DNA sequence: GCCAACGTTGGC
DNA sequence: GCCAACGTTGGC
């Protein structure tokens, strides 16, 4: 077990072909965020053990297990939220200005 | 044909575009992927048509999509074969024109 | 942690 | 229509 990851560490894989997304939607009871990673090959990964397996099956360069966080409250990568309207459910990408209020909204 | 400005329009409405370049049986070739705002990966134009028909009609139309890997919009990746194995790398803005030329042709 | 069985998807 | 590739579930 190690110290908490810094925002600069969580940004590191995004300089080596990875993408990080946070997706916010209304659950059974409340709003909640989930974090996805995309590997450089385009593989979608939704769970930390999946990232561990991927790193083990690929060449070890600068990206390691300590540069990954599945926290939707870490402001790294693209943020999206599922907005319901009479017209229907619509996913919308958040602006840099909007992200802080959403992170606060899903912090207990 | 679509203009770069047209192909950029969905990217202002939560879509993502990627071009992926790899060695085929005979030559280097490119393919285009889109991600919808909901995170759905779409590799074929007819899948985008189906997706648009199933969703609210606003600014984004079929004419805003290009599956041409020669269209310089979105992020570019390339599969390199090395002794350590196949490795995908994201291309820099500097590298992309040379790779588009290499798959034109 | 890994792997078999099985369900789903996408594209020919 | 099929079936390779991908995702899910449950076994030790």
**Cβ–Cβ contact A36 with B under 8 A:** yes
Q: How far apart are CA A101 and CA B8, in angstroms?
A: 27
Q: How far is CA A25 from the centre of its chain?
A: 14
Closest CA to B77 of B68, B86, B87, B90: B90
Question: Is-contact A102 A24, C-beta < 8 A?
Answer: yes
Q: How far apart are CA A25 and CA A92, in angstroms?
A: 11
How would you classify the pairing of strands A31-38 and B75-82?
unpaired
Determine whether the interchain pair A93/B18 forms a contact, defined as Cβ–Cβ distance below 8 Å. Answer: no
| Paired strand residues for A85 | A88
Question: Is-contact B49 B84, C-beta < 8 A?
Answer: no
Structure method:
X-ray
Closest CA to B57 of B65, B46, B49, B45: B49
CB count in 10 Å sphere of residue B56: 11
Tell me which residue has tokens 């990080």.
A20
Q: How far apart are CA B95 and CA A94, in angstroms?
A: 30
> Which of B17, B31, B43, B56 is the best substitution to test chain A (most A C-beta atoms within 10 A)?
B56
Task: Note the residue count of chain A.
Answer: 108
Q: How far apart are CA B4 and CA A78, in angstroms?
A: 22
Angle at A73 between CA A67 and CA A76, to 5 degrees: 50
Question: Is-contact B90 B77, C-beta < 8 A?
Answer: yes
Q: How far apart are CA A14 and CA A31, in angstroms?
A: 26
Tell me which residue has tokens 């028909």.
B53
Q: How far is CA B87 from the centre of its chain?
A: 19
Residues 6+ apart with CB under 8 A from A61: A16
Chain breaks in chain A (C to N over 2.5 A) after: none
Determine whether the interchain pair A92/B56 forms a contact, defined as Cβ–Cβ distance below 8 Å. Answer: no
Closest CA to A21 of A3, A41, A39, A2: A39
CB count in 10 Å sphere of residue B27: 8
Q: How far is CA B25 from the centre of its chain?
A: 21
Residue whose Cα is closest to the C1' of C2: A53
- Residue A87, Cβ density class (10 Å: 0-12 exposed, 13-18 middle, ≥19 buried): exposed
Resolution (A): 1.8
Give me the half-sphere count of Cα atoms (radius 13 Å) on the Cβ side of residue A68. Answer: 23
How would you classify the pairing of strands A19-26 and A31-38?
antiparallel
């Amino acid at each position: 077990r190690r110290r908490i990851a810094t925002p600069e560490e969580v940004r590191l894989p995004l300089q080596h072909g990875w993408r990080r997304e946070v997706r916010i939607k209304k659950g059974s009871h409340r709003w909640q965020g989930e974090t996805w990673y995309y590997g450089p090959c385009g593989k979608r990964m939704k769970q930390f053990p999946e990232v561990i397996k991927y790193l083990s099956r690929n060449v070890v360069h600068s990206v390691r297990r300590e540069h990954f966080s599945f926290s939707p409250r870490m402001p790294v990568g693209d943020f999206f939220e599922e907005r319901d309207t009479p017209e229907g459910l619509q996913w919308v990408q958040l602006s840099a200005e909007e992200i802080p209020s959403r992170i606060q909204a899903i912090t207990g």
